Amino acid sequence: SLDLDLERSNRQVWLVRLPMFLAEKWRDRNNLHGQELGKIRINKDGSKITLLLNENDNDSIPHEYDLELTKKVVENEYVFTEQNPKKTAIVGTVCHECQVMPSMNDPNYHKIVEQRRNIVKLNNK
Amino acid sequence: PNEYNEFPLRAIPKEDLENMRTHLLKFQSKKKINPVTDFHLPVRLHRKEEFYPWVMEDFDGYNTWVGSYEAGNSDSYVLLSVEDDGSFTMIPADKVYKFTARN
Amino acid sequence: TPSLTVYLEPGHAADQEQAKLIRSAIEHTTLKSVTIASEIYYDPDPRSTVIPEDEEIIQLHFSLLDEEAEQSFDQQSPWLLRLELDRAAMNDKDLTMGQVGERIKQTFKNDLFVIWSEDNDEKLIIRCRVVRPKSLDAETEAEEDHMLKKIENTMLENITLRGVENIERVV
Amino acid sequence: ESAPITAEDSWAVISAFFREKGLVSQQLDSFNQFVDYTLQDIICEDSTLILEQLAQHTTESDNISRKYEISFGKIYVTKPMVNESDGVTHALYPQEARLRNLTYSSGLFVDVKKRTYEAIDVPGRELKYELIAEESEDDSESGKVFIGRLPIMLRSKNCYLSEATESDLYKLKECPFDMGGYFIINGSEKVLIAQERSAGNIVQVFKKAAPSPISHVAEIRSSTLQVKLYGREGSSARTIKATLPYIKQDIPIVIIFRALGIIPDGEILEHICYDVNDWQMLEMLKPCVEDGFVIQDRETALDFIGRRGTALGIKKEKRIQYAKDILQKEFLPHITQLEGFESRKAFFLGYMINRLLLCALDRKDQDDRDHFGKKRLDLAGPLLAQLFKTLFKKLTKDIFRYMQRTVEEAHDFNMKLAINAKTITSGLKYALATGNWGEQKKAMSSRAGVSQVLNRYTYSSTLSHLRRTNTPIGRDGKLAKPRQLHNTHWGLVCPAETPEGQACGLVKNLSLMSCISVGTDPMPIITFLSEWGMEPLEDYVPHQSPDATRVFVNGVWHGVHRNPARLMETLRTLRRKGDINPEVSMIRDIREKELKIFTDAGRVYRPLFIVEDDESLGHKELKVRKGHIAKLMATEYQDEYTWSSLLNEGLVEYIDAEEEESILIAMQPEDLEPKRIRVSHHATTFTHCEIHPSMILGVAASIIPFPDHNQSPRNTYQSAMGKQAMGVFLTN
Amino acid sequence: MTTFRFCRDCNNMLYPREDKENNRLLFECRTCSYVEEAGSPLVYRHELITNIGETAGVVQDIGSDPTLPRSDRECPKCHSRENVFFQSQQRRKDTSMVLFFVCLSCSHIFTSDQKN
User: Is C149 within 8 Å of chain D by CB?
Assistant: First the structure.
């Protein structure tokens, strides 16, 4: 429970920022069984990245989002895991930083923003 | 310009996350520190639930890092672990800790 | 708003020049007012410098210093009050560089010696180097900056070249 | 139908405005906000009351420790009614309250639940309490505990007059020309005049004359923090010191950063200065680094803190913990209160000292203390919330004390006996009647004149009285600047109408179209703002991006941004399309690269038009057209298409006194195209237009004919004397 | 113009020190063993009065401020006749009324005072 596992920590790992609602929807336990839930598409120039959700999921969530690059080079960030003093194991080093925004092409954006309006009106202080 | 590569999106089940509690390990430095050379294995990590800060000390005691919990990180980060098939599995983030070197 | 009105002599009443001499002789003049750059600089070896401008002034006094100054070469501080002095402010108060710059200043406490140029140089540069005995303690001698910043502040603030106190302006 | 707009259309829009809002809408809206929302939260703040009675260890049977829990629930409000001495209950109407010297008020009902926990007090072990008894009468009408009586303002939501038609008002014998907006206390009509206040959560930099060593001051009120710069300009000695609450001696800023969690010295200057090239900034910060470098220890500073407390001789570790807790508990509470938010506090302190030092380097000036954009108006709502909070706190304290008393005698307490319902009623009635805004015991030092008896001498006098604001500065105070008229009063305050004597300038009257904001939650705004590409303040590095816009929300810095123009365009798109209510203010300062968002309550705003560039006409023009005016006429004659219809279509916009700093307005509409002397203004990038200049006047001065052919003091004198004419004050 | 120098070990600013046997200046960090060799006898500087030309301040995206006036003067570089103009944004008491022009297209700064 002391040594660090670096045998497979050489691979670079993406750093992506997900929206609060999308991230919370992706914390579902039932979908954690290695299920293929989505896919990514990278432009030839790499400026535009599109995340497309698989049709296996319910139609209540938008199936298209876009990605933007924050830093072209990302250094001094590492990804680790800790398991049962606890045994820790580094996973890798971070390569790029990206942030997710909703896609205009998918109409469901409006719907969730509609829900956003539903969030805005109810709460008061 | 429409060529794209395919990375399937997988996940890690509950049976693996139950005994694997994740914690974001952040080191504060101006230099690219790697444990392959800057840390002499094995390393001793302990707490001397968040009242006791983390302490990571080398075998020789030369590299001692003290880690504190930074709260209010409203960004719920995710861990993208690469499997043998090239797919990415999601791991939710529980806590984030920032480490600084002892004087 | 206190004030004071001064009427000149009958002979000097109609001419502007004696009036300006009196005006200079009344207003309060202090060192901090007459330095466009009274810059605290490192002066480790005052024998030579990197700046070409002060190099010309160097050989002037190094061929113009007495034997006692030659002995006291080591007393000059490892820091310098390097005075780039504004020409206009110096000439406004009819202030001669040498006499006013050094006579009163060294007479007051024998605290600060100077290497100074004649007013003809394009850049009026004075080198104010304080004078201390070599008998100073080792702990004291180590803390050069600690004594000299304090004495430099007490030097700018508390030295009166010419004038009378409390009179801010004369018009 | 795509034609421009003439002044007739301006008067049409104003007619719609008054047909929709009214002249007394501000009081009614504040009261509705208070009754619907704030009242629930005031009780929900302190729902749980706990008694922990340990075992006295007298006998074995007395070894059980007890816990008593009291919780509160919903609030129900009835329509006003009265119970006579005979015990009969009948609904109370304003006529009976007026004639019989009653008090127009209603009753308040709150749900109460009780729990009892019992544990075995074993020495050396933690007490483990278990649920045994829980009294909750939510299934019966007996669960509603009567708590007190609350006065009701006329024509508000609860009052019977709200939905009365003209024949209803006649049969009940109302004046149809009555507007509401006042209480009936002891059978006399009372009104609350707006009270002016200086805003909070805004850093302000001041200056001092120099007989004293002080040179500059930076203030913030959230709890107050003073970070002072001592040392005259041009001298070698620079000192920057902060004055924390419950610390007397004070300690420098580098010590604060060391204690806060930023150990390396190089990071201090990255926190303070955001431009690497500037050398004067670092030159002024050098002595702070030099002095703070001696101690790399938090604990010496914490020992400094510990000594100055009232208790003396405390052990060192307890002093360490105490000084540690002071920072997260009392140091800048308006940012956060919970643990672990240190980066935000460090950056905010850096920003404050940066602004102080910027003012110290003559790049900017002192903050103007007269600017009307830095002042809030408290209506009936906030004042009632204040008093209700105080009285509820006292009442629950009394309940706890009595329940402890009856526990001492081992007697069960009746919840209908522990409550002294007369406290709330007596306090509210006394405050509203006398006007002294405070407790009966401490009324001498409280604010006065907050509640005044309505003036019914003439109708215009009632109108002028229900639209009055008081600036609580000593009316014998010789400060001339608050008295004088200021450039920021254009359109929000009547310039003509002011009293004479000791209240000259201190008493203000609003214009015909200066409303006030109610209040709204900032959380959805922050969530959306982070959604659309905002980097959090935790991951901000000055050197990676030194050209980053800062983002504020109600005066707390949440982070930075890189491309602000599209964010402002999208935000204003959403504000104009109804995704956000238009009472929110959103300013951008290009010169300092700043964004400010305000959602608080107490801001005066006025309507304005919208100018957009039409390419078909090749130049700018208003969004309003002749079709909209025709629709307005159709709806007005039909008395649909209302003022809110204009608002939600992005045709008009509400502007406060702060956003006005970053706009351009064409006063006449014909001034937007390419007797007296009217000059053609050189501007060509217009953004808004004046609906009509006449509205910059109040209600008193809206009766003088040809007021601009008069000397101004004459207009003031007639605005005074217009309240002593004899006429029909009411038609009944 | 004296510049702060940070130690390469712990980012602390380097304090000066002297070497008597070699008579040379060094910069040392009081917390660690790092010592670096001074390149000039200029370590500190204290000016009194600032002979700074007045500056237009922040210029980035200044053309989108709609409360800023306009002029039809001709650009000395790109020969454009549309620009923004404003007074000096430094708030000294004795500043003169000398204008500053920022071109719309090439973002070039110039002044109305063409002193040779």
Answer: yes
Q: Which of D334, D336, D723 shows the shortest CA–CA distance to D497?
A: D723
Does D343 contact B70 at a Cβ distance shorter than 8 Å? yes
Task: List all residues 6 or more positions away from D96 whose beta carbon is below 8 Å from its beta carbon.
Answer: D82, D102
Distance (Å, whole) CA C100 – CA C94: 10
In whole angstroms, give the CA distance from residue D722 to residue D731. Answer: 19
Residue with tokens 């049976």: B15
- The answer to whether E60 is annotated as binding is no
* DSSP bridge pairs for D649: none
Is D232 in contact with D209 (CB distance < 8 Å)?
A: no
Say if D338 is an interface residue toward chain B (CB within 8 Å). Answer: yes
Q: Are D161 and D184 in contact (CB under 8 A)?
A: no
Tell me the C-alpha distance between D174 and D732, whole Å: 7
Q: How close is the nearest chain B Cα to the Cα of A23, in Å?
A: 7
Query: What is the C-alpha separation between A31 and A37, in angstroms, rounded?
Result: 8
Give the type of residue at D360.
A
Is E103 annotated to bind a ligand? Reply is: yes
Query: Is B72–D261 a contact, with Cβ atoms under 8 angstroms apart?
Result: no
The DSSP line for A48-60 is -EEEEE-TTS-TT
Residues shown for chain E:
116
Q: D524 to chain A: which residues are within 8 Å by CB?
A: 116, 119-120, 123
Q: D84 pairs with which residues across the strands?
A: none
How many beta carbons lie within 10 A of that of residue D349, not counting itself?
21
Round to whole Å and give the CA distance between A90 and D33. 54
A20 touches chain B (CB under 8 A): yes
By three-state DSSP, how is residue D174 classified? coil
Cα–Cα distance between B39 and B37 in angstroms, integer?
Answer: 6
In angstroms, rounded to a whole number, what is the distance separating the alpha carbons of residues D146 and C161? 85
Q: How was this structure determined?
A: cryo-EM
Q: Are D337 and D453 in contact (CB under 8 A)?
A: no
Cα–Cα distance, D399 to D402 (Å, whole number): 5
E7 annotated binding-site participant: yes
Beta strands in D460-548 (DSSP E): 468-470, 507-509, 515-516, 535-536
Taking only Cα atoms into account, the Rg of chain B, rounded to an integer number of angstroms, comes to 17
- Alpha carbon E3 to its chain's center: 13
Q: Give the β-pairing of D105-120 and D64-77.
A: antiparallel
Please indicate whether, in this complex, the C-beta atoms of A3 and B22 are within 8 angstroms of each other. Answer: no
Please list every residue in chain E whose beta carbon sits closer than 8 Å to the beta carbon of residue D591.
57-58, 65, 89
Chains that touch A (3 or more CB pairs under 8 A): B, D
Q: How many CA atoms lie within 13 A of B74 on its CB side?
A: 17
CA atoms within 13 A of residue D285's CA, in its CB half-sphere: 25
Strand D688-689 relative to strand A12-17: parallel, antiparallel, unpaired? unpaired
Number of inter-chain CB pairs under 8 A, C vs D: 7
Q: How far is B27 from chain D (nearest CA, A)?
A: 14
> Can you tell me the distance from the alpha carbon of C38 to that of D349, in angstroms, rounded to the nearest whole number?
34
The shortest C-alpha distance from E77 to chain D (Å) reads 25
Residues 6+ apart with CB under 8 A from D430: D436, D440
Please, what are the domains in chain E?
A: 2-46 (2.20.25.10), 47-116 (2.20.25.10)
Q: Which two tokens stand for residue D176?
A: 């149809």
* Least Cα separation, residue E23 to chain C (angstroms): 9
Resolution value (Å, 1 decimal): 3.3
D497 in Cβ contact with D509 (< 8 Å): yes
Q: Which residues pair with residue A17 across a beta bridge?
A: A99
Exposure on the CB side of residue B33, measured as CA atoms within 13 A: 16
Q: Which of E48, E62, E90 lies closest to D234 in CB terms?
A: E48
Is the CB of E31 inside 8 Å of chain B's CB atoms? yes
Query: What would the two tokens of residue D472 be?
Result: 């609580």
Of the candidates D261, D296, D341, the beta carbon closest to that of B71 is on D341
